């Protein structure tokens, strides 16, 4: 209790220095050879690249400025980079470089070669409770860290969780991360993971991350989400109804934890009560969890992904490749001045 309090105080001091004076322009495009796409999204893609002078591999997120502007994502993109360059935690992907050119924004991260949790989860089907609990503990600690800095993460899902070479989680995709001391209103996230208060255009706070943790633990342990359908609208209807059914194999402890996380009533949702994150850490489902040992990465991982060597992408799906164009004219220069 005393060690954590001090740890968090120092962590905030470190974060605030970088939040106040962010790193900028720490590489350029011709310092890397682009190899293969690791994942695609609405504003661009993430590519495996090799840094020429070091020989190191990295994962380069490329965002088309014009697409960002068209989708009204300027502030979110500025949030993403400002926050990711300032944070430091064992389960958060490291931003190694960032820069921009006439056409694009670039965030170059450590390459996490084990692939998305998503792919392993879908292939294997579901994770056992101890396997799911190992991952869940890392997310609990990560949210304790992020929330202490007044950050809301807002996109927890297996697609945004990478497995590292030691079998631990690296959270990626800070696209919707935001530093906020009051409530906020943006409808964003991923449909299956949205808390009811997001859907109902209520203001909301960090409690939405704890709801999303409930969804993640359920999906990890069940192999499917607690609220699923063919279309987002049908998903939202189910979320707002709030009724959750559990697989026959779920432990009583798991069901109890999930009823308290997937709680529509904010005055009752775990992570949001007087005792905060401790209601979760002290829950019976987590009785076997050594929280400090997880933080220190001393716990044996349930699953260690296959790695053939540097640059191996076997743990990722293949994607269609596209030329990276850079116009001779600067696009959206003023908008992205601080990036």
């Amino acid at each position: 209790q005393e060690s954590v309090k001090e740890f968090l105080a120092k962590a905030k001091e470190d974060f605030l220095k970088k939040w106040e004076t962010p790193s900028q322009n720490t590489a350029q495009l011709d310092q890397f050879d682009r190899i293969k796409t690791l994942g695609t999204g609405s504003f661009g893609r993430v590519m495996l690249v090799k840094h020429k002078e070091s020989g190191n591999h990295y994962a380069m997120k490329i965002l088309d400025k014009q697409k960002v502007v068209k989708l009204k994502q300027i502030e979110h993109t500025l949030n993403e980079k400002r926050i990711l360059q300032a944070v430091n935690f064992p389960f958060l992907v490291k931003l190694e470089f960032s820069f921009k050119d006439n056409s694009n924004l670039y965030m170059v991260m450590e390459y996490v070669a084990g692939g998305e949790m998503f792919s392993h989860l879908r292939r294997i089907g579901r994770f056992s409770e101890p396997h799911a609990r190992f991952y869940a503990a890392q997310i609990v600690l990560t949210f304790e860290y992020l929330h202490s800095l007044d950050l809301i993460y807002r996109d927890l899902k297996p697609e945004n969780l990478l497995i590292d070479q030691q079998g631990y989680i690296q959270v990626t995709d800070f696209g919707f991360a935001k530093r906020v001391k009051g409530r906020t209103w943006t409808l964003c996230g991923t449909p299956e993971y949205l808390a009811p208060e997001i859907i109902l255009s209520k203001g909301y706070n960090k409690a939405v991350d704890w709801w999303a943790l409930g969804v993640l633990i359920y999906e990890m342990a069940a192999g499917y989400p607690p609220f699923f359908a063919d279309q987002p609208i049908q998903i939202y209807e189910k979320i707002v109804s709030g009724k959750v059914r559990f697989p026959s194999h779920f432990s009583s402890d798991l069901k109890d934890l999930l009823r308290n996380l997937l709680q529509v009533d904010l005055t009752k949702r775990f992570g949001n009560l007087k005792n905060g994150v401790n209601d979760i850490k002290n829950h019976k489902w987590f009785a076997t969890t050594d929280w400090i040992a997880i933080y220190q990465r001393k716990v044996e991982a349930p699953f260690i992904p296959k790695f053939k060597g540097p640059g191996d992408t076997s743990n990722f799906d293949d994607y269609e490749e596209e030329e990276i164009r850079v116009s001779i004219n600067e696009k959206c220069g003023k908008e992205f001045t601080e990036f």
Binding site: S42, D155, D173, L187, C188, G189, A222, F228, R245
Partner: peptide
Amino acid sequence: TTYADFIASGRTGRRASIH
């Protein structure tokens, strides 16, 4: 089964964010 209904649904692949 709930599993079968999920696997037959259109949202078993990677899910994009919404904004």
